[PDB]
Design brief:
heterodimer; A: mainly alpha; 1 helix; 0% strand; B: flat; binds zinc ion
Chain lengths: 30, 21
């Protein structure tokens, strides 16, 4: 997998890919 | 949070997976 800063929509797309059927939570205030 | 871990810094795949449901 890439080893780099993942931000904004790129971070969300990475989560979508990695998490697969599990889905994910994007909570940037956390 | 994820922004601090993965955007401001860099996340491994394992670290990204902490944000899966
Ligand atoms: Zn971009």
């Amino acid at each position: 997998f890439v080893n780099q800063h993942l931000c904004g929509s790129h971070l969300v797309e990475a989560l979508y890919l990695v998490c697969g059927e599990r889905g994910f939570f994007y909570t940037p205030k956390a | 949070g994820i922004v601090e871990q993965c955007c401001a810094s860099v996340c491994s795949l394992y670290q990204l997976e902490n944000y899966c449901n």
